[PDB]
Amino acid sequence: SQVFGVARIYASFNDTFVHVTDLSGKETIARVTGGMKVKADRDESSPYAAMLAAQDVAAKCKEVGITAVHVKIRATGGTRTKTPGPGGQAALRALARSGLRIGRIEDVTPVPSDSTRKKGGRRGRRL
Amino acid sequence: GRVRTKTVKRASKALIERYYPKLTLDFQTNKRLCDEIATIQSKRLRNKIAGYTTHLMKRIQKGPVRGISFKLQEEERERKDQYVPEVKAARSNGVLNVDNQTSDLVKSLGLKLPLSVINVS
């Protein structure tokens, strides 16, 4: 006896997203970016913005009757890092703190099979 | 600290060799004695030699302490030395065990084997 919205988190760097949808996700619901819960504008990726941010995800999920939740983590990804930033950790523990249930966890970080030539230039990024 | 010194140790460690027998732990009976023996400078120095010594006879008894032996510990090693009796004589399993590949050289070498051995991992 429960329903399941899908998470749809992500934290590079300098920002992070708690972003609920349906389990299909052609529709969406309460999306929360970092800067939003911090106007320093400095630390937009903070172990905290995420923290008070996730709690928006169970305010506007424990609003439109999302009991419970399955949960996705994405890096940048791409070319980039594939080393999850702060975010995703603090979220993954604040989301458990907000009554929410949890189910099926897994990365999605977009991996390439090579090719797109990475930025910087040969001799590199450098201070 | 409280950390001992050469002049001191190496004065008790020389002493402890001869005088284990007069030898004690009431250290106030060594203190006196430790003048009749060494030809010491001072009173302070002298009270720090015997302090150390009593740190030897209080642990010697407890057991074998290190790089120091005085004709009394070395005669309990010709007394503790020796042992197992009987020496090795198998009856009980007689035949003495002889890998079963242990028959070729010694069929090509002697006189009497009372042997034990692995008919074939």
């Binding site: - | 035949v95 065990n97 890998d99 242990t102 069929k107 009497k112």
Partner: protein, 206 residues
């Protein structure tokens, strides 16, 4: 030196079938040993099962080379051993050296338990790696007690057994000696038994 019975008598297939010494090893047959009877289709090397009475009892005249057996030792540093090599040191000649070997003890005039031998020996040539080297030096013959496993360069003869646990490490020197003694010493010449057990010989405490 063909004799008479040193020859197998009425019991040399009965007593090592409860102890395993024909056995070899897992997926391992080391180019460096005639010292593997075939090799079966289900598991495992059935060590050749007639030639350890060939280079564990060369191994007994070579000495017979001691005028004074405490030089005739037993080399080690294991657990199941410290109760057969300590012990080869008791019932005849030898300083036991199990546990501390005493590194140098054969390199180099500067140590403790002092060595200057002429045929030492060596349980595990994986535990005893310095009669192959403390010999590839200067003038100290050696003898490894050469499982399917013993770099053979410079321990010039073979001494095969089996050590994957259990007994036969200690309970095998026993045979170096018995039969070294029946050249020279004091025991007795088919049989009038031999007053220990191969089931004194095992542990002392786990």
């Amino acid at each position: 030196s063909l004799p008479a019975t040193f020859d197998l008598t009425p019991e040399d297939a009965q007593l090592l079938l409860a102890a395993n010494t024909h056995l070899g090893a897992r997926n391992v047959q080391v180019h460096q040993e005639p010292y593997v009877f075939n090799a079966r289709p289900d598991g495992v090397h059935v060590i050749n099962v007639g030639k350890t009475w060939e280079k564990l009892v060369l191994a007994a005249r070579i000495i017979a080379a001691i005028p004074n057996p405490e030089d005739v030792v037993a080399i080690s540093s294991r657990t199941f051993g410290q109760r057969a090599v300590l012990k080869f040191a008791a019932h005849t000649g030898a300083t036991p050296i199990a546990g501390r070997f005493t590194p140098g003890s054969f390199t180099n005039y500067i140590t403790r338990s002092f060595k200057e031998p002429r045929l030492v020996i060596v349980t595990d040539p994986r535990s005893d790696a310095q009669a192959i080297k403390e010999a590839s030096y200067v003038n100290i013959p050696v003898i490894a007690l050469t499982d399917l496993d013993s770099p053979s360069e410079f321990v010039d003869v073979a001494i095969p057994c089996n050590n994957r646990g259990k007994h036969s490490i200690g309970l095998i020197w026993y045979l170096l000696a018995r039969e070294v003694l029946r050249l020279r010493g004091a025991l007795v010449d088919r049989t009038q038994p031999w007053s220990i057990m191969p089931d004194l010989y095992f542990y002392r405490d786990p």
